[PDB]
Amino acid sequence: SMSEEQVAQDTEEVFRSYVFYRHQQEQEAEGVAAPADPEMVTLPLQPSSTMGQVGRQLAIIGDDINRRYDSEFQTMLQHAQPTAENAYEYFTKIATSLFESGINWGRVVALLGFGYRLALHVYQHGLTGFLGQVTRFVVDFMLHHSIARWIAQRGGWVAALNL
């Protein structure tokens, strides 16, 4: 049976695979795509692990709700221009607002997308990459805000792929 702690550990692996595949897809597009941090563009050590495959599948859903979340995150980041010095507080504001009226799978996956976009943003304008920090923000938020528990109740991260 799936524990909240196991879900929290799995979140790091899901997120790292997710960001790799999000940026792979972004390059396969029109335009050049913002440069990504070499860490974000490094293939996971075990891309075919269960959590690697979950992150991959979540990144390649191009349904309308995911594209809507992504566009709104982009717009917010372009306006707010967070930096490495204030990205923690920015992340906490956006994530807390997103879940304030409840948890659902679309919002869980949207938080991975926001982490991807926040890490990519800070890298552009910043002195270096910020992927490890954003990973900690996402993992810790999901644990503290009872999202890891919510996922565990539903069977763990693999349940994000169910219809």
Add this chain to the structure above:
Amino acid sequence: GSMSEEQVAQDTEEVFRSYVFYRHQQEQEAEGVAAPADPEMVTLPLQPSSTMGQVGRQLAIIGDDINRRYDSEFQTMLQHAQPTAENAYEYFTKIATSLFESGINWGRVVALLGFGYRLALHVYQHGLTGFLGQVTRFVVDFMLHHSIARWIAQRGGWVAALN
């Protein structure tokens, strides 16, 4: 409701396919990968969060002595007999009939899943042509016709294996 042999037989495909996925996720880490694997083995099944998917996962990760002993003996057998796609049905039927001749118990039920995995792997490795759908049919049908699905139903269904 009172679990039927028909429901169990229907459930067995999902149990077996999840079992195979989680068995091959361990074999690759232990043996390395010097030939491409069967994509059907290495790709997470659809609806990976179901009760039956969870049963297959738990049975694949058991890892005690009796399950290791069944697995070693199946591998020795296969390495000697070298069944092919042309004769795997007859070879499966012989091994499975022998295994259950003197009775059904949970260790033998799980052993049959292990044998199906190893048979599908062996046949694939011969030609790099997948054989998982065929072996799944062999396992599902054998359990049904040989009253193993009914034995399982009468202990409460697959979910009894979780105990």
